[PDB]
A = this chain, B = another copy of it.
Amino acid sequence: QTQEYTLSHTGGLLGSSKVTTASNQTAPQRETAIISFEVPRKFSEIEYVGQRDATRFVPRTTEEITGTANDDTVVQLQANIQPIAGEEDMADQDYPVVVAYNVTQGAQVEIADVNYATDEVTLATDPADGDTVKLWPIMGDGEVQFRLVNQFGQEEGRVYPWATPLYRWHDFPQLKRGREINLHGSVTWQENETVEVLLDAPQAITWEDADYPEGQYVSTFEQDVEITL
């Protein structure tokens, strides 16, 4: 009676009550938690198996950039940027590495060119004085791990002690058999034995802003599982 299933950063098999989202600590870097997975009312157990099971995670940050009469068109970011699957050609990245949106003009802000490893960007358009823009570059230079909870907060420990980096995460092209991710670890957790992902990085994270254009959800985490009903 074992059937594979999929999870999400939102609702799904949990109703947005047996799951939470959360930002992270930045000023002191801390291996904080951003997302949990509580077993809901029904299930007997859940199973994760790295080296058999998949994973996806698309993280982005947020900032705020004004404008000027003699606007710059150019920005710098304190969050290292890389491509995802190959070149930095925004047309063919398999999803963009940057998103932008003007606030005054409730409209997108398209990109002209990127200063690649400089971590600076050139835009296509010309913002105005005192005009606000919101950006959503991807998140790199940060670790990730899994762990577990014994119904209170007493951790069993961790799935697999060694971490994994996010620039690497972006680097490996998702959506390709063999080139998929398959971590290491093998676990099981029954009712209220919640799981929590952890992240250690300087920079922030963003799940929602209510002004992000592309589908209400700035980032995501998605995952495969093998459930006993």
List chain A positions with a Cβ less than 8 A from chain B. 30-31, 150, 153-158, 161-163
Contacts and interface: CB of A to CB of B under 8 A. Distances in A.
Contacts of A153: 31
Given A30-B30, A156-B157, A156-B161, 11 more contacts: A31-B153, A150-B161, A154-B158, A154-B161, A154-B162, A154-B163, A155-B157, A155-B158, A155-B161, A157-B157, A157-B158
Contacts of A161: 150, 154-156
- Interface secondary structure of A, over-half rule: loop
| Interface-central residue, A154, A156, A162, by most chain B CB under 10 Å | A154
A154 to B, nearest CB: 4
Contacts of A30: 30
A155 B30 CA distance: 14
10 contacts: A30-B30, A150-B161, A154-B158, A154-B161, A154-B162, A154-B163, A155-B157, A155-B158, A156-B161, A157-B158
A27 to B, nearest CB: 11
A73 to B, nearest CB: 39
A163 B155 CA distance: 11
